[PDB]
Symmetry: D2
Subunit: 109 residues, 4 copies
């Protein structure tokens, strides 16, 4: 929930996502689109947090990022966007480069 607690969370790992549901079982198409894109580039090692489990987290990640919706994508402790931005980076090669920057070899390469 907290601002200090979320700052830790996003910096904790290279690729961090906030979803409705889980990678195994997403509860929302927008959250799912993110899970599938990560699957396509072969990113198996990322942090996923379920906002349905905690209303304080649901509300807290919005306040932290200044972003009104879920899913939220962080690369390198920095906010990237939601599923629309992510699909866009998937289609124009930008995500492959962002992944390369984190030391992550994308499967589409």
């Amino acid at each position: 929930g907290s601002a200090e607690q979320l700052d830790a969370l996003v910096k904790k790992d290279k690729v961090v996502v906030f979803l409705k549901g889980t990678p195994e079982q997403p509860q929302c198409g927008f959250s799912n689109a993110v899970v599938q894109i990560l699957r396509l580039h072969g990113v198996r090692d990322y942090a996923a947090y379920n906002v349905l489990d905690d209303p304080e987290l649901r509300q807290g990640i919005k306040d932290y990022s200044n972003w009104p919706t879920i899913p939220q994508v962080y690369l390198n402790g920095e906010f990237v966007g939601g599923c629309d931005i992510l699909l866009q980076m998937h289609q124009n090669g930008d995500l492959v480069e962002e992944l390369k920057k984190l030391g992550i070899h994308s499967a589409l390469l």
Copy 2:
């Protein structure tokens, strides 16, 4: 099962299937139904949280022949989702349908 859901929707005049509960909705689409019913002062309706039950979630889509959540039922009859409910709220049809079922909308006066 179509037979169990048949019973469920005949069991109360007003029956809704949501993501979350009326006291804690988990999706703006489901919240829109909740807030519309709150505006009309429809206090006692059965509300079923599909996030708890994967089988109810699929069962209700099969029974309704409708792909998404929320789902609204009046008098055991399928009415629609949030778009239809909002349309009914804006054109007066919801006040009428509720009145024919002996429900007095708070928007009548």
Copy 3:
């Protein structure tokens, strides 16, 4: 007009109302309908662009009592929007429906 619109949906076996044209649709929701029809090889259909005329945009909603665009009609009867059509595409109902109207789905071929 209800008059003119009733004539439009009964004129052809498959009638769609879209934002845009099948050649260049102007919206993901309308495009989703177009992409489906294409996957089934449905060549002969009437498409009408609601962007062209505000009276059409409002007209088709009041005729179908359906609040959004796209709208799909088969055999003069309202079937639904893009969500309902995807559901039928996935569960095999679209194939059978087309079979009923004497129309060969490409997925059979």
Copy 4:
């Protein structure tokens, strides 16, 4: 073109890219931005209809690195789409950003 669009967005204090016009929006997401601006007393501003120009439509997505329409610009700074604009409306950041540009929101009165 990047240089051309860069000039275009910097030319006016408020710049929006919509589907349709402020008088006749062709999409709920574009309309939300128009309605939000209207509540702040911003009635006259530069509005470009992407449905009239596929080059501008794609160009603006490339320039902003933002996948969708509407897009809102303030002194040529990208602000975002309707979800962000609505958030700025609710938390008071929109009143504050407009004020810094010498526009006095009707909400401030």
